[PDB]
UniProtKB/Swiss-Prot annotation:
Residues 6-48 are annotated as: Disordered. Residues 11-21 have a biased composition (Basic residues). Component of the large ribosomal subunit (LSU). Part of the 5S RNP complex, which is a LSU subcomplex composed of the 5S RNA, RPL5 and RPL11. Component of a hexameric 5S RNP precursor complex, composed of 5S RNA, RRS1, RPF2/BXDC1, RPL5, RPL11 and HEATR3; this complex acts as a precursor for ribosome assembly. Interacts with isoform 1 of NVL in an ATP-dependent manner. Interacts with RRP1B. Interacts with IPO5, IPO7 and KPNB1; these interactions may be involved in RPL5 nuclear import for the assembly of ribosomal subunits. The chain holds residues 248 to 295 of 297 of the full protein. It is found in: Cytoplasm; Nucleus, Nucleolus. This is Large ribosomal subunit protein uL18. It comes from Oryctolagus cuniculus. Belongs to the universal ribosomal protein uL18 family. Component of the ribosome, a large ribonucleoprotein complex responsible for the synthesis of proteins in the cell. The small ribosomal subunit (SSU) binds messenger RNAs (mRNAs) and translates the encoded message by selecting cognate aminoacyl-transfer RNA (tRNA) molecules. The large subunit (LSU) contains the ribosomal catalytic site termed the peptidyl transferase center (PTC), which catalyzes the formation of peptide bonds, thereby polymerizing the amino acids delivered by tRNAs into a polypeptide chain. The modification Phosphoserine is found at residue 25.
Length: 48
RNA sequence: GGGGCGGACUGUCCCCAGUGCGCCCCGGGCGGGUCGCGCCGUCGGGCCCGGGGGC
């Protein structure tokens, strides 16, 4: 009842560090499947 | 399409291969959007701009 006013905590500058994985692009996710197919083919041609 | 810097990720070649991203350097090719200059053409427009036989 004496001092009810609220004071915001001072803001500290961010170092701009990303903590979570970013979204990979179409080129990356297409190269991934291309090389997956290539790897499977090259493994199977030997395993046979 | 290249190089450098930093980094994030993928693949049963993976000691290796491969992809994107932010910055810079790029020698560049492409076209059109804007502006400037030069040249060409107009029985062009400016009462047919201005200078030295017929209406």
């Amino acid at each position: 009842r004496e001092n009810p006013v609220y004071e915001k905590k001072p803001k500290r500058e961010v170092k701009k560090k990303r903590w979570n994985r970013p979204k990979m692009s179409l080129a990356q996710k297409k190269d991934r499947v291309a090389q997956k197919k290539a790897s499977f083919l090259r493994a199977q041609e030997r395993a046979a």
